[PDB]
Symmetry: D3
Subunit: 304 residues, 6 copies
């Protein structure tokens, strides 16, 4: 089975589109789903090989039941709100996700235009974010972002549904959250205090040794080991976004995994805390304003 382009080369631009399906809009949606791969080629082919355009399409739990009869993917459920003692992960509505990536924003915008053109009258937009990466892979906090993502065979194993749910093999699960940052408070920390929040050196991107790394650092809390002592991994493609006039400085988080359990365990540790950590210190400078969960089927599923 052929996956969607979940494992994409590095891109410097992205559009995230989240919509809800209006009553009566089901048929229009199903037709667009069967054409989205053809639209990706149409927009992208003439800008190859530099364009690097791809579109990953995801479907939410409630939407799935409205669109399709028969089997559901085993891990598909609505995003679970987390009400921590200090920080909250909100659940917000979303039926479809389009994760559009390329080397330039214009290509993203052209594909998004064709997709939304086909869905006019059948969907209501909930979120639209135009992201850009900094030229040295840094995010809005000034840290390199993406370093420990798995690659090659380890990425496929971490991200693609396999034999445990054979009808849906080659799919994946995406979690999205839009975060806004308090840059004024962040810039009041010394660089060394910032390093203790994240768990890595700022300039050189070397991980802090186990004797200095705090238990409530981002990297400590999002490091999880399975029963067999192996690392449980996700693939992230976080993107800065913002607006200088409205003082909006953000990170759009997106994490792909073979089962939502891995991502959800990381979120629980961050937001609810553990015995050794009250919460993830990154949350003292970062507020989540959306949260949604989607299944991203194999490309062949959509082509039917």
């Amino acid at each position: 089975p052929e996956p969607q382009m979940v494992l994409s080369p590095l891109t410097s631009a992205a559009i995230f589109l989240v919509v809800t399906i209006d009553s009566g809009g089901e048929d229009t949606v199903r037709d667009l789903l069967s054409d989205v791969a053809s639209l990706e080629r149409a927009v992208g082919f003439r800008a190859q090989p530099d364009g690097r355009l791809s579109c990953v399409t995801g479907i939410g739990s409630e939407a799935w039941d409205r669109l399709f009869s028969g089997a559901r993917p085993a891990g598909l459920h609505p995003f679970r709100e987390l009400d921590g003692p200090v920080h909250r992960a909100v659940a917000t509505p979303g039926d479809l996700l389009f994760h559009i990536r390329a080397s330039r924003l214009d290509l993203c915008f052209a594909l998004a235009t064709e997709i939304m053109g086909r869905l006019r009258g059948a969907v209501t937009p909930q979120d639209e974010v135009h992201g850009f990466k900094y030229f040295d892979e840094r995010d809005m906090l000034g840290f390199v972002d993406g370093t420990e993502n798995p690659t090659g065979a380890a990425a496929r194993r971490a991200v693609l549904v396999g034999a445990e749910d054979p009808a849906f093999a080659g799919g994946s699960y995406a979690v999205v959250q839009k975060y806004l940052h308090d840059i004024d408070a962040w810039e009041g920390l010394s660089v060394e205090a910032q390093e203790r929040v994240i768990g890595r050196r700022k300039m050189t991107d070397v991980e802090l040794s186990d004797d200095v790394k705090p238990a409530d650092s981002h990297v400590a809390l999002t490091s999880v080991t399975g029963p067999d002592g192996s690392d449980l991994e996700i693939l992230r493609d976080n993107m800065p976004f913002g607006s200088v006039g409205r003082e909006e400085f953000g990170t759009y988080f997106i994490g792909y995994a073979r089962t939502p359990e891995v991502t959800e365990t990381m979120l629980e540790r961050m937001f609810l805390g553990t015995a050794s950590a009250p919460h993830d210190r990154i949350l003292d400078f970062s507020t989540a304003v959306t949260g949604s969960l989607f299944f991203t089927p194999a490309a062949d599923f959509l082509e039917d």
Copy 2:
């Protein structure tokens, strides 16, 4: 005198920032102006040679009088509203323009962040547009945009103030208008009818011959000759922008010229018409929602400030 980077190499990203200066904000603004070149180097130097980051700073007519106490540039005045029989060119507030360009949006954003950091508390944002060019220099209407811009020595002559106003030599005048398009109506025209609106072939960008080119086409109305029969020229760096969710598809127009009279004559022809043309047909699919005029001084003028 050293000009600002009005004549930039081609760039694929831009931020347009327009602000008003709040009462009491003048001193903070004057300080920022004397540092803006240093900020451009700070952000841009480490991303050379590919980043191509530049910032052009413009000052409005009413702002100039609040900031500076001596001579005024000869052509600086508030943008003039045009009330045509069908179409209107509105005047909207703006005291400062930052026209930021680079090969990537992140560099534009980083410079804009440092600029606005210094001005917080002293200014109020009026407009912020993040522009992106299509990979084959096309605009949102699907036409190549930029082709007849002047280059080289002809660009310098058309754009930079010279001997006619010697205290302000090396400056320029910028006009900005944000346009929103009705794409549904535009896409209901055949290609040939679109070509009659613009005045050039869509796929190949070859200008229509003089015996087919309508008098109310964009190219006919923006072609102006001087007293001596020479072409009057401006330098444009129009950028697409928009939001697919809100159905906003735009062109941000910016035109630089040695004197505003050239740009204003073109706007009069577009909006008020001529003997042979009621108005520019591009305006039947394009609405202006801002309009402002700025003087962009020589770099030396900004540096030598308090």
Copy 3:
């Protein structure tokens, strides 16, 4: 595991197509060249890596095969079959060897072609030589994007490489070539909308026409074929513009690769002879075939080991 030739190439912007016939007595010289052609490709190309992207695919015709080799023949190898339609004809022309040479620059193609023909002088007669160039936005001589629906990845390997159905020749492929001349004057008299009806896709945006508006005799409708089991039958194409402005020759060199020639031949029958709903492919009313040949392109190992 048998190694294919570079049938599945990255995108290239230049090509040379060379078709020759083998003279009487030339067989031994040809066999020696075949055993060296991959070594020549590395010699010319390696020092221009990684940007040169030089490759050569070598093909052998049906009659040539029997003169060169004893033993088994590939199961689908036969001479190209003439199609005599009510209006349009697909001609068969002679050719014993094909060299399909691609790179990012014409000079590299020319240097490899020079070494190959240097070795074959006196043993072969040239039948056709075409120097092809792709337009910068993947467009062909008709102004349409060309290549869009080619298969990629695993689907390309499945569509193009001989496998278990003919195990001695696994890793080979079949190439069909046709040189087309276009009537550009007639083509350019069509509106863009009428050109879109001929091809089956939008010209500027390369979006396929919806199934209810796509004509039955459009290029895309007739070259879309489904198998016994209702799966899409695919080929890999790398069509190249060519021509000469002084002689008014404006062409497309067609080359199509497939695991069996039946798929390509079915598409040709539909184009030239028509179906119940379509007399012929409308692209043929602006395009004349002046060559036609079929070749087997063996696995690289097959050529090396003789």
Copy 4:
């Protein structure tokens, strides 16, 4: 005055088009001349900054008198045949030259298509050559080609008409010749013998010193000093071309200079020789089959027609 793009950045592709103007063709030609800069922007702008498309337009001596009334450029005359003891530089017909350059052949071809589309029925093609440079600036003989071209202000001085002919300031003179090579004979020389023909090392492109450089080497014969002892220079943009099936391996020579006398002195030395050299040894492996001379006006001259 704004020159044409005679001083171009380096390009790896070119089309050379030479045509003659038929009976009655003059009006159609003058219309095209007034549009050719606008055509160049139309084709090229959307492929910037990588495309690097330019077109330099030239007009021959006889054509000048048919197209324009009034002043003629001072140095404009028909190409002068040189019938030397062994080698000949032929003259062939040509009224208009279009020298089209870009980073890719397709852009050259697109501009040539629009130009010839406008001239159909008014002109007869005499030559069409599609040129390609090798990836390390080498020519068909395997030597680096271009090295001692002038650059910057020295190029402008060597190439652009100035005060000596003020009505035509910003123009230039182009000489073209199509050369075919005998590759078999060339490749039978050792590398060291080839180096003595050219006057430079093959691999490293270092000039042979004055004590080893033969008097009949290409570099010795095309090195000329003026009355003042200063170097007389031209700007060249030679391109390989050919066809493997027909065994055609060529160099298309094009040389620009402020006055044709510089280029003509070099041609005399190559074909007629000097006291110490019978002829340029490059000519024992290279045959000229075309020869024409053109004036390339300032861009504003063409625009104002």
Copy 5:
């Protein structure tokens, strides 16, 4: 299932070769660094992706292996074997660890080497450090293209990676290094044709000499070796120029990877000790080896699991 180190790297234009010995008592510090070297590679390289192309291949010598690890040894691991020929000698020099660092720029190599050696200060003693650079047309210091006949694709994986013959160490490889210094004055006194007879290929065009003119003592003849079954035995090389113009040091750093050391060692025997028809490889009359070491480069998983 085993993940190899980046032995099969894309082409790179810069490299650092670091060879060190492990001091008495340094074993624990070395084991800790080995378990982190892939994490360090990502730390330095990720922010320069995708163009940085940074990789590190780590190798371990025979005597070092027994100091670091208990249990199984790779079947072909032994100290480099000195070859004392009648004229030329291949010396063995000490080395416990190899770090073969490659990228598209030297600064990335240098930054990773700095982090690695920072961790190992006090536990290791440096024996050699070479900063290599590519010529722009893949030439070495002798003026010949270097790398042409290296295997690619599936043939490279088969030639280089340990498989089922030693399943505990599958996905590893064996590296041989030798630093060579050239006598450039003697070399440049030869005619180009005499240089071609030393190497076995044409200098400018890199075309291999035909079998009847290629000398038996040419480099290409002696390093072409066929197995019992008549198949070509191959290695992967990534030779790098280095040197210092003031000290007149012009070198080639030789590095060859193979699935078993016997292939590399057979080539070395032929070069240094000769055959019945060739006393030695003529390249050695202009090239002196000043180092020689053999290393096993484990699968990436083996290093991670420490």
Copy 6:
């Protein structure tokens, strides 16, 4: 109009600095090489255009000038002046000729240095050879961006080229070189904020510290100088990192060009001897100079006409 050497070069990522002394009797050989060095630069560089960006700036020391030439000398040419401060010393070391070779790749630098040294063998003795590389974000070995406040355009030409104050030598410049080694272990024991107080700029973002926090003994404060008339006195720098990981050598090669040595020497006095408010430049607490030389770089025409 006198043609300068390529002092104002585009940005380069690689360099070779070569400093030699002229042996007794070597004068004639040197004069011949000087008259050929521009021809050699084109020979090596032309075939790598337009990306190679190869250039060579040749400098002559005070004592060498008097050995090579008769007549008038440039007005500011003297041996480098030793500075003996209370804590820190600037040493003077021998050097008669400087070759400052820059390009986009090291191999081009190396090839030109090889040709230059080939012509001088037996006439000169090498004193220093450094192969420099820039970090990918223009950072130096201290981790700060390096070059940001260099002048550009017309302001650079005014700062660096001799003019009417010494008209026989117009178009020349003066270069000062110092090789610095850093104590990285001590430097890395500072916090980022303490490092920023040493340099005078923010580490990550390269924004200059405000005048109210910038210490008087920071690098940027001490190297900022105004003339009597209030104008900025500027130099043009092209500092390059270099080093060797095995020897723990981490360096910055300093080179500064100026129209008169007085500007450079005033900055050096402030750094090494201090001012009223600053004992010395804090950068020197982590940086030791081990070479120091001064050269005049003539106009290109001067070298050609020898």
